[PDB]
């Protein structure tokens, strides 16, 4: 269930999808491997999940002169649609 995911999407970019083409965009935490993003969505999103892909990402230290740069960003995943319903709402 909703434990690893941020903003649903943005304007023209994550909007071009979900329109009519079975696909969904949604930000998610970084510590999220493949276990979730299929076990936080698809659960109550009123839809079973499509070829599922759960990406991850993170930057790196540096960037400045003496400080605590060390960091680890966070990573959304593309979830197309199994052929059914577009999360009940959000879409065309």
């Amino acid at each position: 269930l909703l434990k690893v995911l941020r903003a649903p999407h943005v304007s023209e970019k994550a909007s071009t999808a979900m329109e009519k083409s079975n696909t969904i965009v949604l930000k998610v935490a970084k510590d999220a491997t493949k276990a979730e993003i299929k076990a936080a969505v698809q659960k109550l999103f009123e839809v079973e999940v499509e070829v599922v892909n759960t990406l991850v990402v993170k930057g790196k230290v540096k960037r400045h002169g003496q400080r605590i740069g060390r960091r680890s960003d966070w990573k959304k995943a593309y979830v197309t649609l199994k052929e059914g319903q577009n999360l009940d709402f959000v879409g065309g």
Partner: protein, 60 residues
């Protein structure tokens, strides 16, 4: 909920609670989508709850 309440609950009650709180641990996640009724109190409280019950579950 306080530790006292969880301890009183049965093994199944802690499971249904963890699950209820688990199902509960879903509703929120809507701010980034542009919500309002989302409260910051339970944001941090709920994670502790599902955890508190999780600690006692092992204590048993």
């Amino acid at each position: 909920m306080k530790a006292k309440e969880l301890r009183e609950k049965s093994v199944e009650e802690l499971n249904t609670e963890l699950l209820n709180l688990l199902r509960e641990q879903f509703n929120l996640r809507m701010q980034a989508a542009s919500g309002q009724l989302q409260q910051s109190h339970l944001l941090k409280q709920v994670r502790r709850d599902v955890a508190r019950v999780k600690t006692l579950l092992n204590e048993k």
